[PDB]
């Protein structure tokens, strides 16, 4: 940074929060960012002995390296990292009790991350012309 004059050592936002500073000893400048905070979207089925967890908008590398390690299988879905559910987006269901958003569903037999397609066209093989 180049905005600190001789008498300045703290950077403030419009709300009065400290968002950056210049160290008085080393003169090195740093930006301050809030630590990650969020929720876990857990999908549960009454017949299951476990949960399907969705860390919304988080990559699985980020969850395992910076939130918590786990032994459950995982994959990067469109909605975020999904734990304890098989990636089966090529499969579809017309009814869904665990709707995760953006046309995605959690289906329990294990849990399956499946596309949600509540409506489809009635097809006929008649000529178009």
């Amino acid at each position: 940074a180049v905005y600190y004059n001789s008498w300045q050592n703290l950077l403030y936002d419009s709300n009065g929060n400290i968002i950056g500073f210049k160290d008085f000893v080393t003169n090195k400048t740093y930006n301050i960012f809030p630590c990650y905070a969020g929720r876990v979207s857990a999908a549960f089925h009454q017949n299951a002995s476990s949960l399907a967890l969705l860390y919304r908008n988080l990559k699985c590398s980020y969850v395992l390296n910076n939130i918590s390690l786990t032994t459950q299988p995982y994959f990067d879905s469109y909605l975020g990292c999904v734990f304890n559910a098989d990636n089966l987006t090529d499969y579809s269901v017309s009814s869904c009790a665990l709707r995760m958003g953006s046309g995605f569903c959690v289906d329990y037999n294990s849990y399956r991350f499946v596309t949600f397609e509540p409506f489809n066209v009635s097809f006929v093989n008649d000529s178009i012309e």
């Binding site: 905070a37 919304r56 958003g101 509540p118 066209v121 093989n125 000529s127 178009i128």
Partner: protein, 439 residues
């Protein structure tokens, strides 16, 4: 009235005008974590917030019910778009995009699951690229919160404070697929969304029902088709300039961003306490007085959440009303033409079409617009033969070449009087022009 005739301006030429109408059928699904919003990470606040008990359970429950109402509403809108849609498996939108000189290439996206999420029309692409915070926009913005970027996205600050917008249960790509299916259902057999007849014939019969003779319609078919796709092009080009429908779409995103930012600003209100920061209170005071200051912040933040939840309940009630209106417009303007005059936009409504839009549906209403007029003398009825009364059907009686003839009320084309364009009466009403020489 001179004699038994009145002066009326009857159209001598016409065009088709297209009108946009955005109806909001959905809104961003805002979720608050009441515990994380009120108390952040601070154990001294969480201990006190537990003594307010069910206030956070009520905030969470009311927003979960509100989001459930939005999800149910989106499913009802999608069910309405796909209701009765039957398509041929031989339909390939890459080759099949125009019929009877009417072009729907811009209104129709790729059809079938082989495309994946690419089932969005050129019209919908052009309408979605002007709105940053759509469902995919929110997902991409929240994905970037842990990307290590120096940019302080306001959505990232809101989400870290427990304020996050969840994606709708059906993606806007699925809804665009449903609007695409509803649109092609009008262009090809079995025409399941166009009264079971070809689209050009449905447009012709709808224009004829306004009081236009079929003789000019079946000879000006090229002019009608060109006026129709020109009206569609006018609608598409209207989004490149300040537009009321695009402004209405952007108002949904702007009002939501303003409400969420206003809710986040409550975390910086002191509410009469020494500071709005829990860290400053806990670093200045011991538990006997820190609890007093923290209680002031808890009451202020919970009051702000009750106010936001009351505003959200009111806004979602307006969205349910708008979604009910959009479902009614789909059923009574696109899939069919209900006998309601100004329901499907203003003017002489011919037909309507629907396209997906961020948080709603965009309807294109096509109307019969007169270009030039001829002032003529009309008779609303005639007394003929043995005092038998006749009234014109969707038209007027005209003295053309000193002989009584009929013309449609919406297009000047004098044609012979017959049982096809007349309502008979055994007795003629007073003031009906006397014409013993007719029929």
């Amino acid at each position: 009235s001179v004699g038994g005739l009145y002066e009326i301006k009857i159209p001598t030429n016409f065009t088709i005008v297209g009108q946009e109408e955005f109806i909001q059928t959905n809104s961003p699904k805002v979720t608050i974590d009441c515990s994380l919003f009120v108390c952040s990470n601070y154990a001294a606040c969480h201990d006190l917030l537990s003594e307010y008990g069910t206030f956070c359970d009520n905030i969470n429950s009311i927003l979960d019910e509100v989001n459930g109402l939005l999800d149910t509403t989106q499913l009802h809108v999608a069910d309405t778009l796909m209701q009765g849609v039957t398509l041929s498996s031989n339909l390939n939108t890459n080759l099949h995009f125009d019929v009877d000189n009417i072009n729907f290439k811009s209104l129709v996206g790729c059809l079938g699951p082989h495309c994946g999420s690419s089932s969005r029309s050129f019209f919908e692409d052009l309408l979605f690229d002007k709105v940053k915070l759509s469902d995919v926009g929110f997902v991409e913005a929240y994905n970037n919160c842990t990307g290590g970027s120096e940019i302080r996205d306001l959505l990232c600050v809101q989400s870290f404070n427990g304020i996050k917008v969840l994606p709708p249960i059906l993606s806007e790509s699925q809804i665009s697929g449903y609007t695409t299916a509803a649109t092609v259902a009008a262009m090809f057999p079995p025409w399941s969304a166009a009264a079971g007849i070809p689209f050009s014939l449905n447009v012709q019969y709808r224009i004829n029902g306004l009081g236009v003779t079929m003789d000019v319609l079946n000879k000006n078919q090229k002019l009608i088709a060109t006026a129709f796709n020109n009206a569609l092009l006018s609608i598409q080009n209207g989004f490149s300039a300040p537009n009321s429908a695009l402004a209405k779409i952007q108002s949904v995103v702007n009002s939501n961003a303003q409400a969420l930012n206003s809710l986040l600003q409550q975390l910086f209100n002191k509410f009469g306490a020494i500071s709005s920061s829990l860290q400053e209170i806990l670093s200045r005071l011991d538990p006997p007085e820190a609890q007093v200051q923290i209680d002031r912040l808890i009451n202020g933040r919970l009051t702000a959440l009750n106010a936001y939840v009351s505003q959200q309940l009111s806004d979602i009630s307006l969205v349910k009303f708008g979604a009910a209106l959009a479902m009614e417009k789909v059923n009574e303007c696109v899939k069919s033409q209900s006998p309601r005059i100004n329901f499907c936009g203003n003017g002489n409504h011919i037909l309507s079409l629907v396209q997906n839009a961020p948080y709603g549906l965009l309807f294109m209403h096509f109307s019969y617009k007169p270009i030039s007029f001829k002032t003529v003398l009309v008779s609303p009825g005639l007394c003929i033969s043995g005092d038998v009364g006749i009234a014109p059907k969707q038209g007027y009686f005209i003295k053309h070449n000193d002989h009584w003839m009929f013309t449609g009320s919406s297009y000047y084309y004098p044609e012979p009087i017959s049982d096809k364009n007349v309502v008979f009466m055994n007795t003629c009403s007073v003031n009906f022009t006397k014409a013993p020489l007719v029929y």
